[PDB]
Design a protein around this ligand. Structure first.
Ligand code: HEM
Length: 137
């Protein structure tokens, strides 16, 4: 289930973080509007870029903590507030986060592994709801 999935992703986090983030950017190309340094680059080129690996690792490090602190896939309000008040997130709306988790769930469903895809779908929806509650447009 959800708790084991957190362990699975953490066990190979640089690989999963990069692959899931690439699935997101390739499914939703216009989201690169938020990541200009990643434009005009193939997956293999991004995986050799220092700032790409550092960004994806830091994002998924924090995502896994938020997941780990959740109860029944409901994140802490404090974690939602942190994500909304982050200066790096100033321009963002909830649709951006929805798309990230649609891509993550699709990646899990397409993998050969027994991820608990429905729990991550719920987690994404509850996080979007919590982001909205905390003031994200
Ligand atoms: C649960 C989901 C997310 C988590 C855990 C997360 C986490 C993070 C973290 C840890 C940073 C770096 C903060 C620092 O350097 O101190 C960051 C930066 C950033 N994030 Fe997120 N993030 C999430 C979702 C998103 C989404 C959906 C977008 C869509 C555009 C986004 C856009 C950005 C941008 C634009 C930056 C900074 C620009 C840069 O990379 O230099 N984030 N995020």
């Amino acid at each position: 289930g959800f708790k084991q999935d957190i362990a699975t992703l953490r066990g190979d986090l640089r690989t999963y973080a990069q692959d899931i983030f690439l699935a997101f950017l390739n499914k939703y190309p216009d989201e690169k509007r938020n990541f200009k340094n990643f434009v005009g680059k193939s997956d293999q080129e991004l995986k050799s870029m220092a700032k790409f690996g550092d960004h994806t690792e830091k994002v998924f490090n924090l995502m896994m903590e938020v997941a780990d602190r959740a109860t029944d896939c409901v994140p802490l309000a404090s974690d939602a507030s942190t994500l909304v008040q982050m200066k790096q997130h100033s321009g963002l709306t909830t649709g951006n986060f929805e798309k990230l988790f649609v891509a993550l769930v699709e990646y899990m469903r397409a993998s050969g592994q027994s991820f608990d895809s429905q729990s991550w779908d719920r987690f994404g929806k509850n996080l979007v709801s919590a982001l909205s509650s905390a003031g994200m447009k």
